[PDB]
Structure 1
């Protein structure tokens, strides 16, 4: 059995969420989760929107919840760090400035163009081109940045854009995905299974292919998260992901304390 957890979600501390931290905790307890990790956004110099994070307030609030719910659920304090290698030193100073339990590395913008609905990123660009550019940016991060635990949402690019079918297929991106997966395994990083798009069977297929090939290429650590920006969760999607993880041959999920793997 896998530990019942959620290792990716956002509350009002993140610039694009307004949820109560307490409501995440009570929803988690109601479902019977054993452990959760808040992963609020920090992205440096983000285009169009400030993803800043008030660390004193964030730690204070979660620390109070840790004490209050100590006997009901384990609560960790983490970070979703948007990565851009141009800002590597500043990003590292930020990560090193507070005792985060867990850090997700994510790609949200490339060359100051946000990867999102309605941006220049998808303008006059085929889906195949957008996917390749997105995955090349992910590979660049994995090859040149080390200060994180898990690599976030590899299917992020498939959430957005003007295409009739936004899905991402493993086979169409096989070479770059193998390189990313092997690099993650080689550096003992976790692969995140992100359930945002798990309502779509093509998302399930994509993550199944990621999982099986990650195992083939030496991967060991898997994290699991909803990426929910509200307390309400799609538990069916979480259950679908847990099934895929077990079927791929992983029998444990990775959890972290002070950025070290719990053993």
Structure 2
């Protein structure tokens, strides 16, 4: 069976969450999770809003929780790193500055335009064009950046936009997704299954296709996370994602210590 875990979530150390770190831990324990990894935001030069991370306070707090809850759950100290290749040196210096257990590489902005509801990003742009641009940026990251463990939310672009149906389809993006998935597999990176939109069957379909094609292209490593910014989680969405990962033929989820996969 897949280990019960959450490898993508945010607490008050992230600029867009107010959650108490301890509440994530107690919720995790209450739902039988064996392991969790905090993955707070750092995004360099993010447009319109600071996404900085106080490393001394973050590490001190999670280290305290690790000790407090040692007998009950395994806690890892990770990072969701927004990638922009213009800032590669700053990004690598940041990752290498503290003993992170796990790093997610994510695309949150492209060309100083945030990928979010209401921004320039979706304005006078078809959904298909927004998807094309988003995935091109993801490929750019996978081809040119190495200092991470798992690739975050490939469906991020489907969270937003003026469209009534914001869903992303694998087939409409096949060529670029094959390139991304083949490169992740070749470089021994994990694919994140992100449950944020899993209450929508169209999200399940997209990730089903991602999983099947990743495996066909040599993919081995899968991480699972909620992107929850509060402790209270949608547990049905987590169950759906786990069921899907199993159906696709993956028998384990990847966990990391000091940015090295646990074996």
C-alpha distance in structure 2 between counterparts of 1:57 and 1:64, whole Å:
11
C-alpha distance in structure 2 between counterparts of 1:5 and 1:231, whole Å:
13
Q: Which runs of 4+ in 1 moved over 4 A?
A: none
C-alpha distance in structure 2 between counterparts of 1:63 and 1:239, whole Å:
29
C-alpha distance in structure 1 between counterparts of 2:164 and 2:259, whole Å:
40
Aligned to 2:41: 41
1:91-148 per-position Cα deviation (integer Å, ceiling 9, x unaligned): 0000000000000000000000000000000011000000000000000000000000
C-alpha distance in structure 2 between counterparts of 1:42 and 1:262, whole Å:
24
Aligned-residue offset at 1:32: 0.4
Aligned to 1:197: 197
C-alpha distance in structure 1 between counterparts of 2:164 and 2:212, whole Å:
28
1:215 aligns with 2:219: no
C-alpha distance in structure 1 between counterparts of 2:112 and 2:73, whole Å:
39
Q: Secondary structure at the match of 1:128?
A: helix
Q: Secondary structure at the match of 2:139?
A: helix
Aligned-residue offset at 1:53: 0.1
C-alpha distance in structure 2 between counterparts of 1:72 and 1:62, whole Å:
15
1:30-87 per-position Cα deviation (integer Å, ceiling 9, x unaligned): 0000000000000000001000000000000000000000000000000000000000
C-alpha distance in structure 2 between counterparts of 1:99 and 1:148, whole Å:
13
CA RMSD of aligned residues (A): 0.3
C-alpha distance in structure 2 between counterparts of 1:237 and 1:123, whole Å:
30
C-alpha distance in structure 2 between counterparts of 1:75 and 1:13, whole Å:
16
Q: How many equivalent pairs are there? A: 263
Q: How does 1:101-120 map to 2 (within 5 A)?
A: 101-120=101-120
> Can you give the 5+ residue segments of structure 1 that lack an aligned partner in the other structure?
none
Aligned to 2:141: 141
> Can you give the 5+ residue segments of structure 2 that lack an aligned partner in the other structure?
none
Aligned-residue offset at 1:164: 1.2
Aligned-residue offset at 1:90: 0.6
Aligned-residue offset at 1:185: 0.2
Aligned-residue offset at 1:233: 0.3
C-alpha distance in structure 1 between counterparts of 2:63 and 2:99, whole Å:
12
